[PDB]
Amino acid sequence: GAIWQWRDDRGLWHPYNRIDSRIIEAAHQVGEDEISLSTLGRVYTIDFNSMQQINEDTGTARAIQRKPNPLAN
Numbered sequence: 866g867a868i869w870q871w872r873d874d875r876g877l878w879h880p881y882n883r884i885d886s887r888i889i890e891a892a893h894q895v896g897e898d899e900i901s902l903s904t905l906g907r908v909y910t911i912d913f914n915s916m917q918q919i920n921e922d923t924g925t926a927r928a929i930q931r932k933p934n935p936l937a938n
């Protein structure tokens with residue numbers, strides 16, 4: 866239903882991997898405040914109240930955004 870993206874240091878947007886985007890979307894759809902995500906051996910908090918990804922070790926916050934997926938399932 867959705868493709869979530871995160872913003873890099875050059876200001877460019879990157880799609881989350883497919884399963885991570887599913888995890889984020891499912892939490893967003895039910896109104897969660899936040900969901901934890903692990904990728905690349907890192908742990909991120911996805912904070913829906915601020916629409917940011919937060920690295921739980923470094924404190925870096927990055928913007929996230931949601932695009933609709935047109936593709937019919």
Ligand SMILES: Nc1ncnc2c1ncn2[C@@H]1O[C@H](COP(=O)(O)OP(=O)(O)O)[C@@H](O)[C@H]1O
Pocket residue numbers: 871873874904905907918920923924925926927
């Ligand atoms: N969800 C993500 N998936 C893959 N790479 C990411 C993701 N978020 C950030 N990055 C990249 O990984 C590196 C580390 O980013 P981050 O975890 O935010 O820590 P920091 O910037 O504090 O070192 C950067 O190159 C960044 O662009």
